[PDB]
Amino acid sequence: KLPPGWEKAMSRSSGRVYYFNHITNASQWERPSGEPARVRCSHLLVKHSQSRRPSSWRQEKITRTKEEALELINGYIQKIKSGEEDFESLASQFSDCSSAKARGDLGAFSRGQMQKPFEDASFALRTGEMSGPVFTDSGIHIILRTE
Ligand SMILES: Oc1ccnc(C(F)(F)F)n1
Ligand SMILES: Oc1ccnc(C(F)(F)F)n1
């Protein structure tokens, strides 16, 4: 019926059907369209107090809760989707990864190198598509597949 990992859902506030991907945590209104050795992705990372290394170039001691980190991620997703902000802009300013200085770009990679929830989301995204919140031991990610 639908590309890898998609299911039909119903909006609780509008009653209109939408589509949800349980691998990328993406959601959209329109019916989804539809694997390579490698993909290229950028990401925006928000760390929290239970991240493996609760430290980043932005903060020596990262104290925010996981719930607070998810709220920030959700807010960034809203502004990217509204066009109020660009993914690259928010990654450069607010990502708790070193890759912030490269607008979030991680380069190209194969399966085997990344943490599994990050890797599955990266490979299930289509070129150009953005993930919803993706959870790993590092933190919560927004992932943008660029190639
Ligand atoms: O692969 C590498 C090596 C060093 N730095 C980066 C990044 F993310 F900052 F651009 N990527
Ligand atoms: O192994 C590691 C270390 C840091 N970040 C990641 C990932 F995939 F979540 F981006 N994996």
From Swiss-Prot:
Keyword annotations from UniProtKB, A to Z: Acetylation, Cell cycle, Cytoplasm, Isomerase, Nucleus, Phosphoprotein, Rotamase
Chain ranges of the PpiC domain: 36-147
Known EC number: 5.2.1.8
Modified residues (Phosphoserine): 55, 92
Tissue specificity statement from the Swiss-Prot or TrEMBL entry: Expressed in immune cells in the lung (at protein level). The phosphorylated form at Ser-55 is expressed in normal breast tissue cells but not in breast cancer cells.
A GO biological process held by the record: protein stabilization
One function term, GO molecular function aspect: GTPase activating protein binding
UniProt-listed SUPFAM superfamilies: FKBP-like, WW domain
GO CC term, one of those recorded: ciliary basal body
Superkingdom to which the source organism belongs: Eukaryota
SMART domains listed in its UniProt record: WW
Modified how: Phosphorylation at Ser-55 by DAPK1 results in inhibition of its catalytic activity, nuclear localization, and its ability to induce centrosome amplification, chromosome instability and cell transformation. Ser-55 is dephosphorylated upon IL33-stimulation of dendritic cells.
Cell compartment(s), UniProt: Nucleus; Nucleus speckle; Cytoplasm
Reactions listed under catalytic activity: [protein]-peptidylproline (omega=180) = [protein]-peptidylproline (omega=0)
InterPro entries: PPIase_dom_sf (IPR046357), PPIase_Pin1 (IPR051370), PPIase_PpiC (IPR000297), PPIase_PpiC_CS (IPR023058), WW_dom (IPR001202), WW_dom_sf (IPR036020)
Domain called WW: residue spans: 1-34
Pfam families per record: Rotamase, WW
Record note on what altering residue 18 to A does: Reduced affinity for KIF20B
Oligomer status and interactors: Interacts with STIL. Interacts with KIF20B. Interacts with NEK6. Interacts (via WW domain) with PRKX. Interacts with BTK. Interacts (via PpiC domain) with DAPK1. Interacts with the phosphorylated form of RAF1. Interacts (via WW domain) with ATCAY; upon NGF stimulation. Interacts with PML (isoform PML-4). Interacts with BCL6. Interacts with FBXW7, disrupting FBXW7 dimerization and promoting FBXW7 autoubiquitination and degradation. Directly interacts with RBBP8/CtIP; this interaction depends upon RBBP8 phosphorylation.
The record's note on its domains: The WW domain is required for the interaction with STIL and KIF20B.
Known role: Peptidyl-prolyl cis/trans isomerase (PPIase) that binds to and isomerizes specific phosphorylated Ser/Thr-Pro (pSer/Thr-Pro) motifs. By inducing conformational changes in a subset of phosphorylated proteins, acts as a molecular switch in multiple cellular processes. Displays a preference for acidic residues located N-terminally to the proline bond to be isomerized. Regulates mitosis presumably by interacting with NIMA and attenuating its mitosis-promoting activity. Down-regulates kinase activity of BTK.
Protein name listed in UniProt: Peptidyl-prolyl cis-trans isomerase NIMA-interacting 1
Gene this chain is encoded by: PIN1
